[PDB]
Design a protein around this ligand. Structure first.
Ligand SMILES: OC[C@H]1O[C@H](O[C@H]2[C@H](O)[C@@H](O)[C@@H](O[C@H]3[C@H](O)[C@@H](O)[C@@H](O[C@H]4[C@H](O)[C@@H](O)[C@@H](O[C@H]5[C@H](O)[C@@H](O)[C@@H](O[C@H]6[C@H](O)[C@@H](O)[C@H](O)O[C@@H]6CO)O[C@@H]5CO)O[C@@H]4CO)O[C@@H]3CO)O[C@@H]2CO)[C@H](O)[C@@H](O)[C@@H]1O
Ligand SMILES: OC[C@H]1O[C@H](O[C@H]2[C@H](O)[C@@H](O)[C@@H](O[C@H]3[C@H](O)[C@@H](O)[C@@H](O[C@H]4[C@H](O)[C@@H](O)[C@@H](O[C@H]5[C@H](O)[C@@H](O)[C@@H](O)O[C@@H]5CO)O[C@@H]4CO)O[C@@H]3CO)O[C@@H]2CO)[C@H](O)[C@@H](O)[C@@H]1O
Ligand SMILES: OC[C@H]1O[C@H](O[C@H]2[C@H](O)[C@@H](O)[C@@H](O[C@H]3[C@H](O)[C@@H](O)[C@@H](O)O[C@@H]3CO)O[C@@H]2CO)[C@H](O)[C@@H](O)[C@@H]1O
Ligand SMILES: Nc1ncnc2c1ncn2[C@@H]1O[C@H](COP(=O)(O)OP(=O)(O)O)[C@@H](O)[C@H]1O
Ligand SMILES: OC[C@H]1O[C@H](O[C@H]2[C@H](O)[C@@H](O)[C@@H](O)O[C@@H]2CO)[C@H](O)[C@@H](O)[C@@H]1O
Ligand SMILES: O=S(=O)(O)C[C@H](O)CN1CCN(CCO)CC1
Ligand code: NA
Ligand code: NA
Length: 476
């Protein structure tokens, strides 16, 4: 069984969020579990730099101009690179410029990614053809469309990591992407008068998955589907929609072996976590104090994440005696909001605006609680990281957060299953109740420790996930 993942990022070469973590860890797991998995990526500069054994497979002309298909290895896994400097040789985000504007040629940049994915099924590499093309998010949404247009020389799976990003482009681009004009149709890739790459992925794939079981249910509802729910409801009925929960990469996210930490520690040596907390406090300029709970954020600042609620709840949290340590980049409204708060409450609020890979580890390793108040959550990895690190996640009960965290309710404590704090509604009052719950647990240190150990017993294995994907692949 040969599978090609078609996507636009991969840890550690290029990462803007959780997607890259998946692509960086799933293929290796699949290989261990008996699937021959390779990855197709655009040759963004950081990716091209990391693959040092890249060889030429092929040159082709294309609706988007010429490509050199390269192939090499990263961390044991076979990586194809689409080298097209005129599209991909630019620094920064794969999706937008410095000023945060989407590239105006995105339709071509990402249509090409989908086209090469499909072309791979027809022998673009003379030495290896995938049986299944596995496309990820809107970026790769056209891959199943190109496959359909060519009589499905391979089966296709489309997985949604996020339904809010739709890959909308004006209809006139049907002229630019070499698909049948008849594909522009509610029964096809049209979506409210435009082209949608997400719609294309959802419509044309043999099978759709979402990155958690409850998000797979949620996206059949108007609240989480943003107009797409009818397709998803229909695909559910056809048995063509399912959820497979993400794992965590243990090579990189384990306090037991984490080389980025001041101090490594284990589920049975949580005393060794304290030095991380002290150095985190020092690093952020917080009062060095171990009697006080340190709450943390490591998050893209976008609407999805509910961080406005954190801002509203901040006074309440501070009033109860908590500290906050925040790392994130996105909306300036949010950015300015938090910078202001750190100015207003020095020694209590530490903030760092920007993307810092190593610093997120030091936060995860030193904080007591990780705040994930998301409005929606296809899966969420940072809460999984909190669990592994004994950093209790405080989450909204939605999507993968609902699949993965157990509230410290009386039943859950009594059954030995409690692992964090859960609130229901997207408002600060709801958030604040969960925060109070945390303060109550914090005043019973042995109960806190009992919940940490249970959080750290939770297992999120990629090889276990690989097994589900494999069953899926064989049943197509
Ligand atoms: O894609 C298959 C899927 O479609 C619906 O689910 C969602 C859809 O995928 C999504 O794109 C969006 O649809 C909006 C669309 O983008 C807009 O263009 C507009 O749709 C209008 C159409 O453009 C227009 O052609 C016409 O549609 C008629 C169809 O052409 C016709 O074939 C017929 O199809 C119906 C089938 O008979 C029925 O079995 C099927 O389940 O539902 C179809 C009806 O939608 O009838 C159509 C209606 O006359 O008018 C359209 C309505 O103005 O607006 C669209 C809705 O906002 O959102 C969709 C819902 O989330 C279907 O719900 C889903 O069943 C199907 O699998
Ligand atoms: O210069 C001499 C050489 O030149 C040309 O080969 C080049 C190819 O034309 C070009 O495509 C590229 O080859 C890539 C290949 O496309 C890519 O798929 C990958 O090949 C993998 C196989 O996919 C994989 O199956 C495995 O092959 C095994 C094979 O299973 C086994 O039966 C036995 O043959 O051992 C093989 C090698 O272990 O591994 C290979 C290698 O990873 O990578 C290829 C190499 O980069 O680049 C080629 C060399 O530059 C000519 O076409 C060729 O005939 C000439 O001999
Ligand atoms: O790995 C994290 C995240 O990456 C992917 O999301 C990207 C979107 O697909 C992409 O459109 C882009 O969205 C941003 C716009 O470019 C920007 O103009 C502004 O609108 O903010 C948008 C939202 O952030 O950037 C993100 C990169 O994070 C992927 O699809 C997600 O599943 C994934 O979780
Ligand atoms: N500002 C940041 N600095 C460093 N890492 C970040 C930052 N923001 C997010 N991350 C990382 O990105 C990933 C986010 O994954 P996830 O929680 O699934 O959410 P999403 O995919 O929606 O971004 C995590 O590895 C997280 O640590
Ligand atoms: O996401 C912003 C914007 O994207 C699309 O507009 C494209 C357009 O399709 C291209 O032809 C060109 O003008 O560049 C734009 C950005 O990539 C959507 O069509 C539009 O609705 C959306 O707001
Ligand atoms: O992120 S939020 O949940 O707070 C807001 C919604 O996700 C806004 N969406 C839904 C789909 N979009 C198109 C507008 O319907 C843009 C992202
Ligand atoms: Na999935
Ligand atoms: Na994030």
């Amino acid at each position: 069984m040969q599978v090609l993942h078609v996507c636009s990022e991969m840890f550690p070469l290029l990462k803007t969020g959780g997607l890259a973590d998946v692509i960086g860890a799933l293929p290796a797991a699949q290989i261990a579990d008996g699937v021959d998995a390779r990855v197709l990526l655009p040759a963004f500069p950081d990716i091209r730099r990391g693959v040092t054994d890249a060889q030429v497979v092929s040159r082709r002309d294309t609706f988007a101009g010429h490509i050199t298909l390269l192939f090499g290895h990263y961390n044991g896994v076979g990586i194809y690179l689409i080298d097209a400097p005129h599209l991909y040789d630019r620094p920064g985000s794969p999706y937008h410029d410095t000023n945060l504007f989407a590239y105006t040629d995105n339709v071509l940049r990402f249509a090409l990614l989908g086209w090469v994915g499909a072309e791979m099924a027809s022998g673009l590499d003379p030495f290896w053809r995938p049986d299944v093309v596995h496309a990820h998010d809107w970026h790769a949404g056209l891959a199943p469309a190109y496959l359909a247009a060519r009589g499905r020389p391979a089966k296709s799976v489309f997985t949604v990591h996020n339904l809010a990003y739709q890959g909308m482009f004006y209809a006139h681009h049907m002229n630019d992407i070499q698909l049948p004009w008849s594909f522009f149709n509610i029964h096809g890739l049209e979506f409210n008068g435009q082209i949608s790459f997400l719609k294309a992925g959802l419509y044309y794939a043999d099978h759709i998955t979402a990155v958690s079981p409850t998000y797979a249910r949620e996206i059949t509802e108007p609240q989480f589907a943003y107009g797409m729910e009818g397709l998803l409801q229909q695909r559910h009925r056809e048995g063509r929609l399912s959820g497979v929960l993400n794992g965590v990469d243990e090579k990189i996210w384990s306090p037991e072996t984490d080389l980025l930490l001041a101090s490594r520690y284990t589920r049975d040596t949580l005393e060794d976590k304290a030095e991380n907390k002290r150095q985190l406090q020092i690093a952020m300029g917080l009062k060095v104090d171990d009697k006080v709970p340190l709450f943390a954020v490591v998050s893209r600042l976008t609407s999805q994440k509910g961080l406005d609620l954190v801002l509203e709840a901040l006074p309440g949290l501070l009033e109860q005696g908590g500290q906050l340590a925040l790392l994130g980049a996105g909306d300036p409204v949010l950015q300015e909001g938090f910078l202001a708060a750190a100015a207003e409450y020095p020694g209590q609020v530490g903030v760092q605006i920007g993307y810092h890979e190593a610093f997120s580890h030091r936060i995860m390793g030193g904080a007591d609680v990780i705040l994930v108040p998301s409005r929606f959550a296809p899966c969420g990895l940072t809460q999984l990281y909190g669990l592994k690190y004994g950093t209790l996640p405080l989450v909204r009960r939605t999507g993968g957060l609902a699949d993965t965290v157990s509230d410290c309710s009386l039943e859950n404590l009594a059954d030995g299953v409690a692992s964090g704090f859960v609130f229901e509604d997207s408002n600060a009052w709801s958030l604040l109740r969960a925060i109070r719950r945390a303060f109550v647990l914090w005043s019973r240190p042995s109960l806190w420790r009992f919940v940490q150990r249970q959080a750290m017993a939770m297992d999120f294995s990629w090889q276990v996930a690989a097994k589900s994907y494999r069953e899926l692949y064989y049943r197509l």
